[PDB]
Symmetry: C3
Subunit: 268 residues, 3 copies
């Protein structure tokens, strides 16, 4: 019920003052709040990438967090901002364009409102920056003691726009999944294949990558990077419980380029 | 009370330098909240830093110390100044024009040169007045040091100011220039204000003058979503000035333009 | 007490990973102030991380927990350690040399291996000891957990140390090397200390660069020469440096860490 920590994500970058003006607005409304960036380097307009970056935020952040996020190419239109309380007791504020989808998969919506009250907005609201004047402003009002019900009208959880998320499946003689995202600092590849599907099969595994070119590798299944020699490839379960590909102390995607959506098949 | 420090520089955030400044500030003012504006000002680029600070006074609350340095004159006779503005904020930075546009937004009421050793981090290193004078003095002010204790009062006329172009009426339209690029998205921002373009009462001709002329016929829109994806628009930005963009694409990647380029807007 | 956490890693700040670590830390130590040092250490580059931490003890106050990981050994027998230094700061990181130069600045007084499950984020994921051991333990120390509760005491000599080259006197000058590039500006930082160049000044010096001879003025600061002109100076860390006034020295004279620099009188 206290929410003194604001965790802030956007696609505006941190190379100029724009992300910081939003923090200025938030500190003016909630001067005692702690404000921490998640990241401002979501690719421009990339709601799905934003959604992926928020997926694990509910689990890592404590109950007293307001998750404040915008990737908002619909700014100044009928696409409203929503404010949600999740099952962990956190509050989330963002555009109703699918941005909060994967965060809500981790901790479901309990109470959901559209943000329509002028008193939780930064006035006058500029049409090209709902991110500052509605999303950041409303997050700060919630951190400063405003009740969730005062932001605007209640909506049903099914009125929250959801992005589709592919599930891995069993096929003839293995598991077909896909690349969800690249761990870009390192070049590791993250799939949607969970622990339980590869249990049957665990060793040394055939991995088929369908990208610009189709590549078959025979890879050891390891707990961590150091279990093969430097520069050598491995399969492992990542910090999110999903199958991943890497090179020990090198960059897997620089050797075998792959993009999100590319098929990965794992077979004995 | 000024317990919020908003911090700008050109040292980047890719190494420890900007953080050592925060270490010095926390040692002086251990209760202060410190928030970055940005550290990605182009190296030595006082004017770009000044532009990035222009809207900081408006967005940040009255209890802010704006701490900023882009200081190629470090270790020379170019002094640091501390200013109280009409909003009641404090500003600290080199007297080299860096605070010019912030002071245009909220004028100086009181100005001092920072000369007292007791508000500096001793011994002061000649190549980093940003840490040992600007950051240190901002933190002393945040810890409750009176502005008068930093050094002698100076006339606000002795604050170095940067020139800026004004838009004006010409034969059949308004001639301004490109002030900056919204680089995360590729949007173009001009100095042409709302009040001059009273003549949306009715598509407009925009003439961009560089090494070549780019003449476009553009719709005047409230926001990005009012044209199809990839299509160009003219709009009033978050600062109340004419801007150019592509809906969910990058305007300057299609039509390169740089700051200083002339822009005329006229009836078609 | 240690209510300020200063946080470094190699995971970048372009995605949520560094922020999930801060979430874990705020959950353990909700009153803590958390400030990044940087997350842009080059991947797996323990030496670059160690150099970026060198000046942190001196600039940060005694109530700081220095939380740092560059941990390609995650999920192996390479343990995390927690140290109290002579300034009274706490430091947490992998025992892989990362803390070496921070400890040169302010030596270890008490050192423990981090083995207690009660200072870790459970369950500990093998590929992210940085989050589940290093960040979690830093936050428990910031919340007032005694250092002795993290795990068993070790001798200071069991802390892995990275070698660091010393400049020396040779026939008619000083032989040092490039330690790092001040990359925002292109300035070159050497391992030559203030005291070795004091001996040598009459204020013009000759520099021989690895893989060029320059005759350079020794200046207090950049603005003592015209814009675009080269200078020698003592940097903010008390070491000899090379720069161009309002330009990029390494873009004109490329030099990499480990390249020899010899300084001799005119
Ligand atoms: N040219 C453009 N087209 C569409 N949307 C744009 C834009 N420039 C910024 N934004 C969008 O403006 C939002 C602030 Cl509310 C950001 O999250 C960004 O997605
Ligand atoms: N090579 C160089 N020439 C002139 N100024 C320089 C420099 N390297 C860093 N600074 C300047 O040192 C300041 C710290 Cl006080 C920064 O703001 C930066 O502008
Ligand atoms: N492909 C890879 N090889 C070796 N180590 C890797 C890696 N990807 C991430 N890390 C390492 O995982 C640590 C988190 Cl504990 C980071 O500090 C990073 O150094």
């Amino acid at each position: 019920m206290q929410h003194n920590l604001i965790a802030f994500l956007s696609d505006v970058g941190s190379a100029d003052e724009a992300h910081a003006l939003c923090k200025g607005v938030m500190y003016g409304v909630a001067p005692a709040a702690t404000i921490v960036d998640i990241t401002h380097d979501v690719a421009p307009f990339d709601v799905r990438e934003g959604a992926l970056f928020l997926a694990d935020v509910p689990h890592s952040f404590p109950a007293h967090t307001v998750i404040c996020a915008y990737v908002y190419p619909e700014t100044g239109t009928a696409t409203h901002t929503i404010a949600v309380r999740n099952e962990k007791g956190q509050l989330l504020v963002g555009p109703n364009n699918g941005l909060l989808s994967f965060a809500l998969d981790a901790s479901p919506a309990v109470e959901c409102h559209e943000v329509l009250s002028p008193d939780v907005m930064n006035q006058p609201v500029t049409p090209t920056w709902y991110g500052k004047d509605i999303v950041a402003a409303c997050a700060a009002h919630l951190a400063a003691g405003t009740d969730l019900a005062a932001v605007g009208p209640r909506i049903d959880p099914k009125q929250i726009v959801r992005l589709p998320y592919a599930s891995a499946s069993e096929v003839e003689g293995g598991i077909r999944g896909e690349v969800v995202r690249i761990d870009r600092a390192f070049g590791n590849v993250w799939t949607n294949i969970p622990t339980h599907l590869i249990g049957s099969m665990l060793e040394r595994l055939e991995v088929k990558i369908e990208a610009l070119s189709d590549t078959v590798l025979e890879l050891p299944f390891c707990k961590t990077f150091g279990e093969v020699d430097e520069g050598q490839p491995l399969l492992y379960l990542n910090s999110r419980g999903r199958l991943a590909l890497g090179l020990n102390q090198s960059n897997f995607i620089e050797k075998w380029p792959v993009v999100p959506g590319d098929s990965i098949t794992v077979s004995p």
